[PDB]
Amino acid sequence: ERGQLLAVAGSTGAGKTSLLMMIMGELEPSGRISFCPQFSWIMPGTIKENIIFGVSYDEYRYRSVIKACQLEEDISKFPEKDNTVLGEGGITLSGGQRARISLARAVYKDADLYLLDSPFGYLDVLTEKEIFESCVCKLMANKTRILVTSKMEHLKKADKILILHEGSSYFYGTFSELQNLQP
């Protein structure tokens, strides 16, 4: 299962009662875990810090994460670039840009397991298609990824898929193995 993408569909909860929030909840403080929430946040400071804070700096990893998360064009436009200060005292970002800063912060952290709880929810069909493909598919291709989704296109591209029911019931397999089940 190491280095694979598990797409979780079905009854996976919503908001602060999502299945992943619970789990991460029950785990509240044995390998490293990087969690990406459904709702994006920033803390006052630079764009760079909002992505790399707390993790050791790698020039190659930082720049690749920005490229894959579609932040290269956004950042370039700002006069200060990635040294642009965020918040009430600085620049105010759009939901889409902040969603991308949130994903980059999770993707940049070196961890043994990545738990992405619907991080494309507030992104457009075009932005999501590109980020899913260049970030979770290509960039994170050698990482153990657990992506909560609800998009049939994300189940088609995952190594293994998991469909949850409200009850104890569930399907664990591939998208093709699911298609052959009661076609």
């Epitope: 929430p37 920033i42 803390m43 918040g87 902040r98």
Partner: nanobody, 117 residues
Framework: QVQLQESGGGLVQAGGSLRLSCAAS????????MGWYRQAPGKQRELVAV??????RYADSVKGRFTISRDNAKNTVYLQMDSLRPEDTAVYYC????????????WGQGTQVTVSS
């Protein structure tokens, strides 16, 4: 809206400890992250630690000494400050990231932490 009041500041000797509290009021259910900052005189507010469901992060200068924790029942975010050095002398602030249909951040009032030799 969200109101943040910091408590727990004080005068300590080097090697000592302090447990800082950041008490949230108002729409505390909409807070999705909490940062801890420090400001020295005539200098900017530097992020020290940040907490949210799934992660805790620390500045390279505080790692292995400071612990960011939380109590959801009390709506308080703590900063355990161990093996304190004079350079930790600052005014510590908490910033909360809030999403309630629209997004913004909120600052606290500050708590003076003084560390002597």
């Amino acid at each position: 809206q969200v109101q943040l009041q910091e408590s727990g500041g004080g005068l300590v000797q080097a090697g000592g400890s302090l447990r800082l509290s950041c008490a949230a009021s108002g729409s505390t259910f909409a807070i999705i992250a909490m940062g801890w900052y420090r400001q020295a005189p005539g200098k900017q507010r530097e992020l020290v630690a940040v907490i949210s469901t799934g992660d805790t992060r620390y500045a390279d200068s505080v790692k292995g000494r400071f612990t960011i924790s939380r109590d959801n029942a009390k709506n308080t975010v703590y900063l355990q400050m161990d093996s304190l050095r004079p350079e930790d002398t600052a005014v510590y602030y908490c910033n909360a990231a809030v999403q309630v249909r629209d997004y913004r951040n909120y600052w606290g009032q500050g708590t003076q932490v003084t560390v002597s030799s």
